[PDB]
Amino acid sequence: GPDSMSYRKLKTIPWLELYDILRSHRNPTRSPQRPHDIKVIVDTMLIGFGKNLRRVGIDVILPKDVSDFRKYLKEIERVGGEHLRHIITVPSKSYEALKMDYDNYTIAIPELNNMSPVDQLIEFFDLFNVDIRPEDVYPRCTECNSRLQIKFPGPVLHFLHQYCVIHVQNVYRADMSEFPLEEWWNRMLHINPDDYDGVKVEMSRPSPTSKWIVATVPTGCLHITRQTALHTNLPDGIEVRIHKVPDDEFKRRNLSFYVCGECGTVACDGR
Amino acid sequence: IDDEDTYGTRGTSNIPMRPFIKDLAPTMLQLLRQDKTDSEKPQSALCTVVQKIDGFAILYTAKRDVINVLLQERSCEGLERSPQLGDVAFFDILPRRIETKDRLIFKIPYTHIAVKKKPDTPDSLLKIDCFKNSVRCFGGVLEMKVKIALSKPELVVEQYHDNTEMNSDHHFYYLKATNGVLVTIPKERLLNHLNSKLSADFDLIAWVVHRKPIGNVSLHIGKGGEAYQQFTNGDIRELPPL
Ligand SMILES: [Zn+2]
């Protein structure tokens, strides 16, 4: 409704709370699959839904428009095999049209768009057999579909926020020479791995006096003063989208952050 | 001032072996093995080994309109041994063949494929050492020192706007360095220092970072990257960060 209330955004629900809701929903007549082994493409009216499917790890294509949507459908069908996708839509003229050429792959879910994000997922999980696990806090980037998520202890991203956002925002900076670099370097050295799921941050720099400070974790690294993150699987890094993290996220205790190695979006478990 | 960041980093020998997590990309090695080239005249390019993945390597090159090069150890000609991180040599390269599958799978982190490692000559070995002296590597990232001759008559500035889903309201300049490479800079960081003809009364010096491209340009100054204004009167001061 134009005047109806907004639902709680999936981004605000802790994964364990969402895991408890969804773990009890499955279609027992279908073979169970891990989320990343389920390939989906959403009709153009279900983009937000598709992003929520990505949150729990489903592989989802989000078309930019109807033409883009149809091109994908033709290409998926040409390639076939492992690359065939479930087509999710709602009862509509689009669904009627899709059935003419994609009946065997199209699923129309009634009222999917007049329905809360959690209820949307329940509808999907009732149709499929998804094997989810408590440890998968952020398996996939909701914005670009990438699985290449670099997991950092919160202090690393706090460091990044203070250097790239706060320092130049609070007083005029002719340069970065006044940032307390050594203070933050020493704090990085004393991150307790026991507080962040056993993730040990390895700090390195070319010389004791160099500003080229790198924080390395098993899934990649972050070049703090270059605002550049690099997933271990990739040859090229990405500018971290750090200006978009609310300042208050860094007051949360023992919080880990995920930096997407392909688009730079920063994510974390909901409060 | 190349500064303390250049100590122990100049060249290409400080490139760490970074693990490839295979279960995140279980079909990656098959694509690399199966990938083909477009059938045109191969072009020479100076390439540096920046990643190694069981029987394959990804190479960086400053050649225009090339965003990384795949090296297939089993298909490339001219190889005496398996490539090593930081190796620099000239290769003949071709664009990879675009397939329908490309739209349906992970992002492909290279545009070209090496077809042959050119034998080294006394002249090329001089160009290779020159290149090594002009870059610096650490923590898995390559940087290159460049000068933008904004104070000279030749136009070396171009505006680039990318309406991609996530970078719609980000605007950049493409800057052409004296050595011929293109680099990006956020427009708002330089706009107020240019005249109406996109020149200025200073030259811009900076170590630029190699990372994922804006358009076809993969070298970047960034919002806070150290950059220096060399004024025609001799003064040198830092370009304020954005
Ligand atoms: Zn992403």
What is the residue-wise DSSP string for B132-197? HHHEEEETTEEEEEEEE-TTSSS--EEEEE---TT-TT-EEEEEE-TTS-EEEEEHHHHGGGS-TT
Cβ count within 10 A of residue A133: 12
| Torsion over CA: B209, B212, B218, B221 (sign) | negative
Are the Cβ atoms of B7 and A206 closer than 8 angstroms?
Answer: yes
* Residues contacting A203, CB < 8 A, separation 6+: A185, A188, A189, A213, A214, A215, A216
Which residue from A163, A201, A164 is spatially nearest to A180, judged by alpha carbons? A163
The CA-based angle B227-B230-B232, given to 5 degrees, is 160
Give CA–CA dist A51/A60, Å, rounded: 8
Find all residues with CB under 8 Å of B159, minimum gap 6, and list them.
Answer: B171, B172, B173, B174, B187
> What is A149-188 written as a DSSP string?
EEEEEHHHHHHHHIIIIIHHHHS--SSSTTS-HHHHHHHH
Q: Please give the structure tokens belonging to residue B36.
A: 């083909």
Report whether A150 contacts A219 (CB < 8 A): yes
Q: Which two tokens stand for residue B186?
A: 């956020």
Residue A268 tokens read as 């974390």
Residues of A in contact with B226 (CB under 8 A): 175-176
What Cα–Cα distance (Å) separates residue B196 from each residue in B169, B191, B204?
Answer: 22, 10, 17
Contact in structure between B110 and B68 (CB atoms under 8 Å): yes
Is A249 in contact with A255 (CB distance < 8 Å)?
yes
Phi-psi region of A32 (alpha: psi -120 to 50; beta: other; left: phi over 0): beta
> 1-20 in B: which are within 8 Å (CB) of A?
3-9, 14, 18-20
Residue ranges of A 144-183 with Cβ closer than 8 A to chain B: 144, 146-148, 163-164, 168, 172-176
Question: Looking at beta carbons, which residues of chain B come within 8 Å of A168?
Answer: 224, 241-242
CB contact under 8 A, B5 and A211: yes
Method: X-ray
Closest CA to A58 of A151, A142, A134: A142
CA A22 centroid distance within chain = 18
| B10, B18, B50, B85: best to mutate for the A interface, most A CBs within 10 A | B18
d(CA A176, CA A100): 61
Residue A51 token pair: 């992003």
B-interface mutation test, from A62, A177, A233, A262, most B Cβ less than 10 A away: A233
The two beta strands, B112-117 and B69-72, are parallel
* A residues 64-123 lying closer than 8 A (beta carbon) to B: 64, 71-72, 75-76, 78-79, 83
Beta pairing partners, B96: B37
| Beta-sheet pairing, A202-204 with A149-153 | unpaired
**B198 alpha-carbon distance from chain centroid:** 24
Q: Which two tokens stand for residue A122?
A: 């329940």
For B108, the 3-state DSSP assignment is coil
CA pair distance A179, A175, nearest whole angstrom: 9
Min Cα distance A157 → chain B (Å) is: 16
Query: Which strand (E) or helix (H) includes residue B56?
Result: strand B56-60
Phi/psi at B113 (5° precision):
-135, 135
Contacts of B212 in chain A (CB under 8 A): 236-239, 262
Spatial separation of the C-alpha atoms in residues B172 and B163, rounded to whole Å: 12
Q: Which residues does residue B137 pair with via DSSP β-bridges, in sequence order?
A: B142
Spatial CB neighbours of A7, under 8 Å, sequence gap ≥ 6: A116, A117
Q: Which two tokens stand for residue B88?
A: 């620099």
CA dist A263 and A146 (Å) reads 8
| CA gap A31, B219 in Å, rounded | 47
Task: Mention every residue, 6+ apart, whose C-beta is less than 8 A from residue A81.
Answer: none
A80 sits in the region (left: phi over 0; alpha: psi -120 to 50; else beta) called left
